[PDB]
Amino acid sequence: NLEIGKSILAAGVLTNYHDVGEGQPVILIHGSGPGVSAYANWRLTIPALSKFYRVIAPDMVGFGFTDRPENYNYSKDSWVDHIIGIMDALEIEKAHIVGNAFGGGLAIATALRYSERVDRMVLMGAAGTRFDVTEGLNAVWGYTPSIENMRNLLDIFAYDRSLVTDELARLRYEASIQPGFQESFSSMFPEPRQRWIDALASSDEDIKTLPNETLIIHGREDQVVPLSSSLRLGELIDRAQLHVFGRCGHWTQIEQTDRFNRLVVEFFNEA
Amino acid sequence: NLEIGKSILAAGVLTNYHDVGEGQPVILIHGSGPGVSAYANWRLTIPALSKFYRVIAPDMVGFGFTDRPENYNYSKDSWVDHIIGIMDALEIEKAHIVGNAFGGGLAIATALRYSERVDRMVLMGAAGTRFDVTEGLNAVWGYTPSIENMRNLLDIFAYDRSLVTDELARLRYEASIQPGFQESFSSMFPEPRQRWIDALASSDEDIKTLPNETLIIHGREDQVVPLSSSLRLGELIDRAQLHVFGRCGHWTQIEQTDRFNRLVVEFFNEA
C-alpha cells in the first residue's frame, strides 16, 4: 500500500508520513474526506515539488495510517499540536505549508499560534472562515460506506465527472473501510456539522494579523467549500494572491495538476 | 522618444506600433488614461514576452502617436476594426491578446466579432462588463493637464504611492500635453461617463459564448475598475482563470511585473 510511508513519533502519536526531496521544507496537509491520506491527496504534487524542495506529507491524527489513540481529543488545537510535533520530530524549524481544505484551516491556525514556524502558505478550497455548511460538505462528512456513496462523493469533488470511474470509487471505498477508518471518521464531524466549520475557522481579527505571503487557490465550481470563503480569506490576508480555476471543483491539485504545481513552485521559488 | 516605434497603415489609419520577438503572435492593447501609449503601458512586459513570442503593441487610434483622423468616429466597433486592421496589415491570422482595462474591453469585443482571429486572452482590470462608474475612473477620464492632477491620477492607479515620484508625474504630464493628445482625450469620454463604460461592455449573453482559454487578472485595491467586475467576468467566461494580486492597484503589469510576466508566459506556453 503506497499510502503507507515512513513512521515517526510526533506529539506522542505514531505518525505515518512521506518525506521526499531536499532543500527548503514544505509541509503538505491533506483534507478531511473518508479514506483520505497524505499520499492519496498529494501523489501528483509531491513528484513536482520534490524536485526543488523537501516535501513532507503526514497523515493527520485520526486520518490515514497514523495511530488513532484511544479516547483521543480531536480539535483544531490538537491537530495544530500534531503538525508542530511532526516539524519538531524532523528538526524542521520553519517551513512553507500547503493546506488542502481541512488542512488549510489547520495551516491558518498553525501560522497564528506558531508564526515563527511558518513561512509561506498555500490555502486550497480551505477551511478557516465561517461559511454556511453546504450539502456537499454535509454529504462528505456524513459518509457511510458503499461504492455508490463514494461515487457520489467523488462526483461532489469533481468538475469533470468522467474522471470518476467505477474502479476509482471501488478503490476509495476500500480505503474508507480499512480497520478503524470509518469509526474515527464518523465520530469526527457529527451533526450538527456547522459546529465543526466554525471550530476549524479562525477569527477575522486574527487572520488579519497574518504577515505571511499567501497564495489562495479555489475551484470555481467547488461544491464542498464555497468560492465566497476564499474571496473572504483574500480580503483578510494582506499579502495574499487568489487564483481561481474555472472548470474545477474541490480537487484543484488533481483536476488542474500541472497549473497547480507550476503556481505553487513559482510561488515558493520567490522566497 | 521611445514611445514612438514603427509606422504602418491599418484600417486606413497611420498607426504607431512596436513589434519585438519571433514566433506565436501576441497583441498587447493598452489602457485609456491621459498620455497613455503602447510603450508606456508595456515597456516592462514586452522584454519578458518577446523572448518566447512575437509581441505586437500598437497605439490605438485616438491615443499615443497613431494618427488622429479629423472627425473620426470613435467607438467600440471602430477600435475593434483598428485592431483587426493592424492584424491584417501584419499578416497576423490568429493571435493571443492581452487587454489592459480599456484594452480588455476591446479584446472581449474583438473575440466576439472575430472569434477565428483570437486564440487565448488575458484581461487585466478589464472593461467589458457594466459596472458603476468609480470616482477613480471619473477622475482619470476627466483629467485636465497639471503635474498635480497627474500625480493624483498616478496615486489612483497605484497601491504603493511611494512609486509615484515628482519626476514620474512630470514626465506623464508632459506626455499628456503633446500636440493633440489632451484634445482627443477630453472629447473621448465626456460626461456622463457611465455611457462609455456601458458602450465598452459586452452583454452577459455574448460573453458566455466565448470559447477562448482566458486569464483574468486584477489588483485587489484597484480604484479604477472594481474587482467585482472581474469576478463577474470570471463567472461568465467558461474557460477562465482569475488571478487577483493583493497589494496591487490598476497597474498590475507594473506593480507586480515579475509575477504578471510569469503568469502570462506560462498561460500562453500552455497553448
SS (H, E, C) chain A: CCCCCEEEEECCEEEEEEEECCCCEEEEECCCCCCCCHHHHHCCCHHHHCCCCEEEEECCCCCCCCCCCCCCCCCHHHHHHHHHHHHHHCCCCCEEEEEECHHHHHHHHHHHHCHHHEEEEEEECCCCCCCCCCHHHHHHHCCCCCHHHHHHHHHHHCCCHHHCCHHHHHHHHHHHCCCCHHHHHHCCCCCCCHHHHHHHCCCHHHHCCCCCCEEEEEECCCCCCCHHHHHHHHHHCCCEEEEEECCCCCCHHHHCHHHHHHHHHHHHHCC
Instruction: Indicate the residue of A234, A259, A270 with minimum beta-carbon distance to B220.
Output: A234
Q: Among all residues of chain A, which has the CA nearest to that of B220?
A: A235
Does A160 contact chain B (CB < 8 Å)? no
C-alpha cell at A4: 503507507
Identity of the amino acid at A245: F
Cβ B242–A247 below 8 Å, yes or no?
no
Peptide bond into A69 cis (omega under 30): no
- A258 Cβ partners below 8 Å, 6+ apart? none
Separation of alpha carbons A243 and A216, rounded Å = 6
- Which residues in chain A are closer than 8 Å to B262, comparing Cβ atoms? 266
Measure the CA–CA gap between A99 and A216, rounded to whole angstroms. Answer: 10
Q: What is the CATH number of the domain that holds B176?
A: 3.40.50.1820
CA A196 – CA A30 distance, rounded (Å): 17
Q: Concatenated DSSP letters for chain B?
A: -TT--EEEEETTEEEEEEEE--SSEEEEE---STT--HHHHHTTTHHHHTTTSEEEEEPPTTSTTS---TT----HHHHHHHHHHHHHHTT--SEEEEEETHHHHHHHHHHHH-GGGEEEEEEES---S--PPPHHHHHHHT--S-HHHHHHHHHHH-SSGGG--HHHHHHHHHHHTSTTHHHHHHTTSPSSTHHHHHHH---HHHHTT--S-EEEEEETT-SSS-HHHHHHHHHH-TTEEEEEESS--S-HHHHSHHHHHHHHHHHHHT-
**φ, ψ for residue A118, nearest 5 deg:** -115, 130
Beta strands at B95-100 and A95-100: parallel, antiparallel or unpaired = unpaired
Breaks (C-N over 2.5 A) in chain B follow: none
Q: Is residue B177 within 8 Å of B171, Cβ to Cβ? A: no
Q: Verify whether residue B250 is a known catalytic residue.
A: yes
| Side chain identity, residue A157 | F
Please tell me what resolution, in angstroms, this structure has. 1.7
Alpha carbon distance B94, A121 (integer Å): 39
CB contact A262 to B (< 8 Å):
yes
User: Integer distance in angstroms from the first to the last C-alpha of chain B?
Assistant: 35
Q: Is B132 exposed, middle or buried (0-12, 13-18, 19+ CB in 10 A)?
A: exposed
Optimal mutation site among A228, A244, A259, A264, interface B, most CBs of chain B within 10 A: A244
- CA-nearest of A47, A38, A44 to A102 is A38
Domain total of chain A: 1
Residue B244 Cα to chain centre, angstroms: 17
A261 chain-B contacts, CB cut-off 8 A: none
Per-window interface: A 199-238 vs B, CB < 8 A: 220, 231, 234-235, 237-238
Residues of A in contact with B239 (CB under 8 A): 246-247
Residue A59 belongs to domain spanning? 1-271
Q: How many other C-beta atoms are found inside a 10 Å radius of the C-beta of residue B195? A: 12
* d(C-alpha A33, C-alpha A158), whole Å: 13
Q: Which residues contact A153 (CB under 8 A, 6 or more apart)?
A: A33, A34, A139, A140, A143
The per-residue b/e assignment along A197-234, b for 16 or more CB within 10 angstroms, e otherwise, is: beebbbeeeebeebebbbbbbbbbbbbbbbbebbbbbb
